[PDB]
C-alpha cells in the first residue's frame, strides 16, 4: 500500500503546515501538523475544555462506530516551544492520503496550552518520530508510520514541503519525479528518538564551504533552522544591520535587506536554501525590523533542521531496520 497527501502552509510565512487526516467511521477529517520531531497523534476533541477550543475542528469519538476507549490510558506532552497538551486515548481507523491504519491510538485532548488554542488552523499533531518517544501511559503506543510500515510497498515516508506553497507527504514510495539529481542518503541515530543525523558543513551565500560536522534533527514540526551560534553569527554577519535582539528573542534584520542563501552539506552533496526562505517578516505589524529564519540553537540543547531547511529539499525518512535519511534538491 501507499498514501499521498497534500500539506498546506497555515499562513503566509509558512509558520507550519497542515495535512488532512481522516479519523473514525464515518470519517471525521481534521487538519494535523505532521511532526517528525514527536511521536503522538493527538487531536482537539469533544473532550477538550471548552474554553480552550477556539475555531479548531474537533474529533468526537462517540460519533465514530470504530472508536474504542483505550481503558486506563492517558498522555501528556510538552514541546520544545513551551506548549503542552494532555488527555485520554481511543483507538480508531486513521487514513492519510488513501493509506489506512486500523487500531491507531488517537490521543484525545482534555487540556491544551494557550498557543494551541490561539492557532485555529491546527486541529492536532501527527507524530512521525520514533515510537520510543510516545507519551501514552501505561502502555506506550505506536505512531501512524510504525503501524503502517509493514503494509507499505517500501518502509519509507517522504516530506516535500513547499515555499509559500503546498507540498506533499508520501508514504510507502519515493516519487522520482519530485526531485532533481540524486538522493544522498546519510546515517541516522535513533538514540534520542529523533531522525538525528550529521550535516557535513555549510556555506553562506557564494562563500566557500566550511567542512564541519553539525549533529541535528530533521524536524518538520519546527518552523525555523536552529544551528550553533558560530554558524548563525557567520550567516547574519553578511546582512547589513542584522543583530541578535534579546527583547525580540533572536536575530532580526532590516526588512529592506536582500538575504543571502545558506547551504548545508549532506555527505558530499549540498542543499541550498534561497535567501527569501530565511525572511519571516516584520516582528510586529508595520515594523521595519524582520525576523530571521536561521537562529541559534544554543538555548535548545540540539540543532534543528526545521521547515526552513527541509522545504529546500525532497527528504526521505527511511524506516528500514537501520533507518537513514535522504536529501535531494528539487
Curated annotation (Swiss-Prot):
Enzyme class, first EC level, given as a word: hydrolase
Organism superkingdom: Eukaryota
EC number: 3.4.23.22
Record-level Gene Ontology MF annotations: aspartic-type endopeptidase activity
Disulfide bonds: 255-290
GO annotation (BP), single: proteolysis
Domain Peptidase A1 positions: 17-328
Active-site residues, Swiss-Prot/TrEMBL: 35, 199
Swiss-Prot/TrEMBL keywords: Aspartyl protease, Disulfide bond, Hydrolase, Protease, Signal, Zymogen
Reaction(s) catalysed (UniProt annotation): Hydrolysis of proteins with specificity similar to that of pepsin A, prefers hydrophobic residues at P1 and P1', but does not cleave 14-Ala-|-Leu-15 in the B chain of insulin or Z-Glu-Tyr. Clots milk
Cell inner membrane keyword on record: no
Family, per entry: Belongs to the peptidase A1 family.
Protein name from the UniProt record: Endothiapepsin
